[PDB]
Amino acid sequence: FQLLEPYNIKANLRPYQIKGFSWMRFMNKLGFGICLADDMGLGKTLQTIAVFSDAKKENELTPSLVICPLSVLKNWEEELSKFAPHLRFAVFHEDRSKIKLEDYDIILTTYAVLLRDTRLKEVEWKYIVIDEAQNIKNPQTKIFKAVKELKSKYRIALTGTPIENKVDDLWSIMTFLNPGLLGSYSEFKSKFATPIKKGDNMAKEELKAIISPFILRRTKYDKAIINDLPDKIETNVYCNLTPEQAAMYKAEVENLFNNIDSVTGIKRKGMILSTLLKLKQIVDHPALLKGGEQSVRRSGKMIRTMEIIEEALDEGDKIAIFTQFVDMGKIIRNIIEKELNTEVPFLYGELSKKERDDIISKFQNNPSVKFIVLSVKAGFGINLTSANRVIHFDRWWNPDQATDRVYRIGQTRNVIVHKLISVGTLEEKIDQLLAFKRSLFKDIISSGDSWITELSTEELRKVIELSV
DNA sequence: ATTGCCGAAGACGAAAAAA
DNA sequence: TTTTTTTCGTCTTCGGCAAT
Numbered sequence: 001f002q003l004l005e006p007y008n009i010k011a012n013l014r015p016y017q018i019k020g021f022s023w024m025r026f027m028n029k030l031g032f033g034i035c036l037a038d039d040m041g042l043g044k045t046l047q048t049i050a051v052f053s054d055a056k057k058e059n060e061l062t063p064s065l066v067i068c069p070l071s072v073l074k075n076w077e078e079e080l081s082k083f084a085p086h087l088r089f090a091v092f093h094e095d096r097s098k099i100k101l102e103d104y105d106i107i108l109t110t111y112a113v114l115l116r117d118t119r120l121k122e123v124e125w126k127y128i129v130i131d132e133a134q135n136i137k138n139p140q141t142k143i144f145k146a147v148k149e150l151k152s153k154y155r156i157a158l159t160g161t162p163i164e165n166k167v168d169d170l171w172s173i174m175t176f177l178n179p180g181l182l183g184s185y186s187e188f189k190s191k192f193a194t195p196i197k198k199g200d201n202m203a204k205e206e207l208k209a210i211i212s213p214f215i216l217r218r219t220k221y222d223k224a225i226i227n228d229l230p231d232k233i234e235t236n237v238y239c240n241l242t243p244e245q246a247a248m249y250k251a252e253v254e255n256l257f258n259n260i261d262s263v264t265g266i267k268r269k270g271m272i273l274s275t276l277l278k279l280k281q282i283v284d285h286p287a288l289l290k291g292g293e294q295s296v297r298r299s300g301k302m303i304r305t306m307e308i309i310e311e312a313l314d315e316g317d318k319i320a321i322f323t324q325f326v327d328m329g330k331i332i333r334n335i336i337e338k339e340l341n342t343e344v345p346f347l348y349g350e351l352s353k354k355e356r357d358d359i360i361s362k363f364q365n366n367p368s369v370k371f372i373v374l375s376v377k378a379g380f381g382i383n384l385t386s387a388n389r390v391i392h393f394d395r396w397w398n399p400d401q402a403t404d405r406v407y408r409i410g411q412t413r414n415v416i417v418h419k420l421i422s423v424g425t426l427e428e429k430i431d432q433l434l435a436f437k438r439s440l441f442k443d444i445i446s447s448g449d450s451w452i453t454e455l456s457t458e459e460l461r462k463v464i465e466l467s468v
Numbered sequence: 469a470t471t472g473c474c475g476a477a478g479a480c481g482a483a484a485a486a487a
Numbered sequence: 488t489t490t491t492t493t494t495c496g497t498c499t500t501c502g503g504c505a506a507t
Contacts (some may be wrong), residue, residue: 070479070480108482110480112479112480112481112498113480114478115480115481115482115497115498116481116497137498138500141498141499142497142498143498242493243493247492292490297477297478303479459485463504
């Protein structure tokens with residue numbers, strides 16, 4: 001064994017990532033299928049990229065395949081090009097005929113697409129990374145079928161949850177990594193499964209022992225790492241619009257550009273403001289403008305928010321959701337309370353200082369109260385030191401750590417901050433400008449969003465209009 | 469307390485229409 | 488032939504509801 005050196009990775013890997021990355025490689029080189037199971041938050045992706053980078057210099061990368069959930073496609077896209085500008089990749093999703101596999105180091109696909117494309121089926125793959133491997137639990141599924149039939153020199157199954165404790169899920173992921181290690185799903189099931197399930201120790205102990213050398217996992221509270229992680233970790237959660245929202249969106253956009261031409265001056269700014277405002281609501285949830293049933297299905301953000309809440313809950317986290325519309329504040333609280341059948345305090349302006357402080361007390365002190373929804377604009381006294389998980393539903397903060405400090409966010413415990421952005425909306429494109437620069441793109445942008453009202457009818461169109 | 473056979477719903481593509 | 492919006496269809500998990 002030996003700790004490798006992050007190759008041309010464009011970032012500083014914390015100790016545990018330098019040990020998980022090199023532990024992964026070491027085993028791959030000794031010809032084994034391993035599984036990285038660290039907690040989301042520990043950055044499996046990056047690590048998995050450090051591997052790629054090194055596997056590339058030793059000439060063992062090109063061509064490798066990554067199979068992930070649609071949810072996280074742009075996530076790899078982004079992390080790849082930022083941390084490894086030097087690695088060539090292709091997204092295999094649409095117009096997949098205009099893509100020649102072999103001419104790229106890496107190829108990103110979807111479990112979905114694997115089930116409908118032979119070209120993949122028949123390649124000599126160096127690496128094959130199954131992202132969020134839970135998508136394979138049931139060996140009866142077709143994707144399991146489709147995935148085992150693939151050809152690979154090296155494999156890595158990435159998962160968020162512990163496999164060491166879900167007997168049924170272990171097999172597929174394990175057998176994919178190293179075929180045979182557990183026999184047949186039938187054979188396995190009646191020597192470990194039913195046995196372990198039926199209360200057995202000599203079963204687990206062994207089963208564990210056979211597997212353990214292929215599974216590396218590190219929680220966010222592991223002494224080793226609690227103090228190395230940044231105290232505030234921020235990921236961008238990509239959301240898709242529901243057909244309904246996209247109609248409304250498209251509807252409002254192609255409407256401003258039917259009157260914008262008519263007017264100018266003061267009214268041009270105002271016009272673009274409300275139309276901007278209506279958009280920022282349509283992406284949040286359609287009921288904000290149409291009323292009607294406040295369902296999770298009507299909104300893309302609500303769909304992702306629920307998936308997140310699910311994980312976070314899986315480690316008694318205390319989640320805090322922010323939103324610029326009081327009305328959105330009520331819907332979110334309503335949906336969560338009903339669906340999870342839990343208690344959810346909601347804090348916004350109007351409430352009496354005595355009311356506020358009553359809620360913040362329920363949040364940090366009642367063991368059962370796991371959420372809290374806030375609809376306020378920073379300049380008040382909110383004490384959120386109990387929150388380890390935070391969600392920004394929409395972009396409610398004045399264009400930050402000086403905003404998190406108004407509340408006591410980093411303060412007392414490591415915290416993961418999810419930032420929701422609707423793909424193709426003005427939400428993603430406006431980041432493409434905040435990230436565009438903060439030397440020439442940061443001064444007038446502090447002036448609220450007024451800076452957008454001056455843009456230019458053609459530029460405004462590229463920014464607010466729905467993209468593909 | 470386990471299986472197992474609907475129905476139902478949701479998530480994703482792809483074919484099918486059509487300003 | 489194009490390009491865009493709708494509808495269609497497959498895979499898959501899960502909530503009953505009977506039945507051992």
